[PDB]
Design a binder for this molecule. Sequence first.
Ligand SMILES: O=c1[nH]cnc2c(C[N@@H+]3C[C@H](CO)[C@@H](O)C3)c[nH]c12
Ligand SMILES: O=c1[nH]cnc2c(C[N@@H+]3C[C@H](CO)[C@@H](O)C3)c[nH]c12
Ligand SMILES: O=c1[nH]cnc2c(C[N@@H+]3C[C@H](CO)[C@@H](O)C3)c[nH]c12
Lengths: 282, 282, 282
Amino acid sequence: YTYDTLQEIATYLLERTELRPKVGIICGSGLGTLAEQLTDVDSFDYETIPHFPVSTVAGHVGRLVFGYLAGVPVMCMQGRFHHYEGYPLAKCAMPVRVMHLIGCTHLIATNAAGGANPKYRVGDIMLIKDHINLMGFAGNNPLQGPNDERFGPRFFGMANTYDPKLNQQAKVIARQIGIENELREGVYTCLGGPNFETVAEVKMLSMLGVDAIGMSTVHEIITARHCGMTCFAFSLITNMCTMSYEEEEEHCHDSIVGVGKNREKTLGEFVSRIVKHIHYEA
Amino acid sequence: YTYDTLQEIATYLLERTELRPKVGIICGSGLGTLAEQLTDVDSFDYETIPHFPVSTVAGHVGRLVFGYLAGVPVMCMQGRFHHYEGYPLAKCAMPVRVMHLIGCTHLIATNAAGGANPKYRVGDIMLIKDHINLMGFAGNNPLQGPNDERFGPRFFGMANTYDPKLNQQAKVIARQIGIENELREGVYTCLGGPNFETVAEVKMLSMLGVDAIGMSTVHEIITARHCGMTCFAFSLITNMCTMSYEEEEEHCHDSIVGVGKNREKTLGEFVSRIVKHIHYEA
Amino acid sequence: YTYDTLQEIATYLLERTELRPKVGIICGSGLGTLAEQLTDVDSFDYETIPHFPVSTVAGHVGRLVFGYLAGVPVMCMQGRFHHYEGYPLAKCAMPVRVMHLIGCTHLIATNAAGGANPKYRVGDIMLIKDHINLMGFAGNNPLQGPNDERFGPRFFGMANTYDPKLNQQAKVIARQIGIENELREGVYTCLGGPNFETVAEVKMLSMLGVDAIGMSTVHEIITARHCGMTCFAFSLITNMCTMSYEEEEEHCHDSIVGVGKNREKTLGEFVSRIVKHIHYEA
Ligand SMILES: O=c1[nH]cnc2c(C[N@@H+]3C[C@H](CO)[C@@H](O)C3)c[nH]c12
Ligand SMILES: O=c1[nH]cnc2c(C[N@@H+]3C[C@H](CO)[C@@H](O)C3)c[nH]c12
Ligand SMILES: O=c1[nH]cnc2c(C[N@@H+]3C[C@H](CO)[C@@H](O)C3)c[nH]c12
């Protein structure tokens, strides 16, 4: 994906919707119903958009929806792309660069995750304060290759990547809507997958300071920071990681999506208030 | 590798052998003599099987041996494929899909490993109870890409991957044949190699909970679990990891292969009786 | 990059300089002025060398300089190649195989790094005593693929990779030139980049025993060891890693390169005394 190609995707969309969102939202496993709450919608199935990858995972509808979320224009990825589907991280992160070119100044990244922190409960929302990019340590980063200064600088720091003020405002909101007890804040990691983690892997990740284990988001976030966007992200805790050889393990994708589906009203209200906050501060 | 190509390999072999084994065995460095103890054998050089990779590593003979191991039909990879040879993990693990299509319900994977646990000794057999897939964390996984459901599900859990009942029976067997003082049980990891680990690496890997350090196996067993195969695995400790800047280090592939070669009797007997337990249990 | 191609490159240079150096030097970020202290130079822009990558990083000049360092013939990479540029590790490390083919017995690898050890100070030189190759754990190694025995063995051990005796002489030189308090010794790791590390990543890397965090060197050293070369390496600490969500982060490539430029006299004297030691001892 060159700059020119990405700008063709952006123009393609800007000619076909009048909406000019300042916020992009990526909906993960069981979070796709965020997109169903928008009004005055212009919708584009991924398989119809030039150069666009398709979502092959169940519960990822595969649709870019422009609409109003409680009156605020947003761009919504209803469905994400994952490295385990065979997509390089630059390709999974490509919509973030499209968002940036469309004029989004903010990225809200959303995902399902397993709770490696044993104090978490299924159904909790964990604010991502930080991440550990293991893929990146190994050389697998979406920014590898020639750098285009029209997007951003060759090198950049990660301080405040997960915006501290939006994280603090999300705590204020959680308490307004009565979900503070189901609200966490901690560290996310993105692993290859598609298999889930062994007991030894979960022990190692957790001792290194990981609270939530998923398979996305980090490379999306790094692409967003590269081009100057403000990021906010959260994990819905859809299952607890297996902590012992003694525990019965029942990890199931359908149940994992189910967790989010059953919380669609609360998630929608939560994201809706975050977006409201971003809009009024601007 | 498509399901159709793999089925073609399976059909090619099944047309050239009368044997219908329920157990695939993979022999690692110094374990190649397991194949030599089979009776009434149909043997296939890797060079001659369609689409098959070749063993380039010393002590890896490079042939697929169907035969009887104490009267039980087995198929045996005499020599394996390593990622450091330049094969993608899916290519290294492809024989597991062939075993499955042939009708193997069980995979026994064997390997050489450096002992990172300083309680171990050269010549110990360490039952693999669990692994840590650092390659998979970084996105290097044999299941990356489109998922064929004729093999297995998109996602799956890792609990009980190294079958607990078979590890238990291996402890029983170790007692029967006098080797309980050379029998450990612990956590394996598969590194890229082909260089051996530095002192700082070994310390980091111990602290994360690794007992045995190798360069194979993990993706073979991930491929088997995806197929729904039951897995049993062990490492022969062929050398102790260097643990200080003061220890003299003498890691040598020829010596490493020799550790297994000098234990062929015991290894054959140990593996033969696990296979026997599997046969009797169906 | 085959042996024959590498010999093409070696022969190309050997035809165009009469210098026969025994020591190769790679200059990293802020260390390029080392090449400027050479006398009687034959200089080659990377652009003009057959099959050579080019340096795209600010402050990496991109010239191979054959010259005298205080009377000792050296071969000096003024600027290097990084994986985040899009170069595979074997391509970043390729100039090390050329140095060997030319007759270099020693590699001096220098880099800039972030101080993860909080007792380090900006401007310190950390001798590399060891490294943790996280790229290699995942399978990203310059030696992956067929092995040519004309360079070295399939497998080899890492003990004393960073030469203990040269590290000892460095400590003696440090006191001779008045920089003993600014001399450290510890463990280096090579991350993919190009972004710098999160707070959570720096914490995890410290915990695992890393003192200095960089993006180069490790694969150059592994290639050198493969060839049988003696290796000496150090990091100039150009910035402290961010260790808290409360500190102000000002990671800047221009400043980083500036730390070395501001120390060119010292760096040159230090390196010049090491080469003088290698030369006398031989
Ligand atoms: O326990 C886990 N480990 C890794 N990822 C997840 C996720 C996140 N998603 C959900 C989905 C498979 O259910 C895949 O895209 C990763 C939920 N739970 C876990
Ligand atoms: O100390 C070790 N580190 C990593 N792997 C091994 C192995 C396993 N095999 C042995 C073989 C090189 O001797 C290569 O295929 C990996 C034995 N000892 C060690
Ligand atoms: O804090 C750090 N983290 C990772 N690498 C470096 C380096 C080494 N170089 C410097 C350069 C970016 O300034 C890139 O080539 C990596 C200096 N400081 C840091």
